[PDB]
């Protein structure tokens, strides 16, 4: 096979937005492999070497007046402009979660089980998932996958509750998320899965 050495250049032109577009920070960042070597930060207003590999460029670019003026205007000509273009389908994207609750294993009541609250297909990533046992919030014995990006502008998470369920108990998974216009709860009733009555 081909095991010749590799050499990688990256550039990242970043726009960071705070309180809508009230505050914007623009970064023009250049990398050799993973090493950032030179950067323009709009909070600074000129290029700075990040490593010694970048020193020749910070000096050279900062000596070009038209160059600096263009980068100093980027917060508007580039960042706020592109925020406006994309807002409706990015910033304002809200996709409602599909929520499924199930026991991890078919187990008779009065034995340990894991109750799974699978929260799928949602956007954006900010979410709170809570477990309740007969209306009391459970805090211990709660394990999750964390937030999983699917790569297609949706997320999922599985949030599991360790418990020993008994006949007549009602467990509830509650989701809080920006897509909701009203509350989202899904119940699992222990008496719906009484394997050995």
């Amino acid at each position: 096979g081909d095991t010749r050495p590799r050499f990688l250049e990256q550039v990242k032109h970043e726009c960071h937005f705070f309180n809508g577009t009230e505050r914007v920070r623009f970064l023009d960042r250049y990398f050799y492999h993973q090493e950032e070597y030179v950067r323009f930060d709009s909070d600074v207003g000129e290029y700075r070497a990040v490593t010694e590999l970048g020193r020749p460029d910070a000096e050279y670019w900062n000596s070009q007046k038209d160059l600096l003026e263009q980068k100093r205007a980027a917060v508007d000509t580039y960042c706020r402009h592109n925020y406006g273009v994309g807002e409706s389908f990015t910033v304002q994207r809200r996709v409602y979660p599909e929520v499924t609750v199930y026991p991890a294993k078919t187990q008779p009541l009065q034995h340990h089980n894991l109750l799974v609250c699978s929260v799928n297909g949602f956007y954006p990533g900010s979410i709170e998932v809570r477990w309740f046992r007969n209306g009391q919030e459970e805090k211990t014995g709660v394990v999750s996958t964390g937030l999983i990006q699917n790569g297609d502008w949706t997320f999922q998470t599985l949030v599991m509750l360790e418990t020993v369920p008994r006949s007549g108990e009602v467990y509830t998974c509650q989701v809080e998320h920006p897509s909701l216009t009203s509350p989202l709860t899904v119940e699992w009733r222990a008496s719906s899965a009484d394997l050995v009555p």
Binding site: P5, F7, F17, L53, N150, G151, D152, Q156
Partner: protein, 180 residues
């Protein structure tokens, strides 16, 4: 604390002569440019309904990336990249139910350089039907991530693996999924 980040991320890699030009919003791809076809490729079709991007502009940027790479390679005395092997996870898109269409996701994370071979296997055999993949997606630590997808009909019979090859690995890396 910031609310959102938009990044125009690019790379050029030697000696492969491979490059990429994409935009990222909060960690998801808006689009990339197919530089062979000179075409803007939107990650979700619907993004192109109102927005546009002049794909030729990417080619100009990639030519600067190449020229810059040549310079940085010399400045570094031909210090090459250190291979960082991927972490691989296989996921389903939704809870799995027999005979209900689903999608296997192979998530390839925390690796560099951005050259990888990913093959879906059904019962050990490469699947080259109905598969899709993303371009290389940038990480905040300047490594890469990537997704490959396989629509499937769940059964008790079949098993699946995502096979990943990368210069940082000692052997092909297999991540398994089967019905439970």
């Amino acid at each position: 604390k910031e609310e959102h980040v938009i990044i125009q991320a690019e790379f050029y890699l030697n000696p492969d002569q491979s490059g990429e030009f994409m935009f990222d919003f909060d960690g998801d791809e808006i689009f990339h440019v197919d530089m062979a076809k000179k075409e803007t490729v939107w990650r979700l079709e619907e993004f192109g309904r109102f927005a546009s991007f002049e794909a030729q502009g990417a080619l100009a940027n990639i030519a600067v990336d190449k020229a810059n790479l040549e310079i940085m390679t010399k400045r570094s005395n031909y210090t090459p990249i250190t291979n960082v092997p991927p972490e691989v996870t296989v996921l389903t898109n939704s809870p799995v139910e027999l005979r209900e269409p689903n999608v296997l996701i192979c998530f390839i994370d925390k690796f560099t350089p951005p050259v990888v071979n990913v093959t879906w296997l059904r019962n050990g055999k490469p699947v080259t039907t109905g598969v899709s993949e993303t371009v290389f997606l940038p990480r905040e630590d300047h490594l890469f991530r990537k997704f490959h997808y396989l629509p499937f009909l769940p059964s008790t019979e079949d098993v699946y693996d995502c096979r990943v090859e990368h210069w940082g690995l000692d052997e092909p890396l297999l991540k398994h999924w089967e019905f439970d």
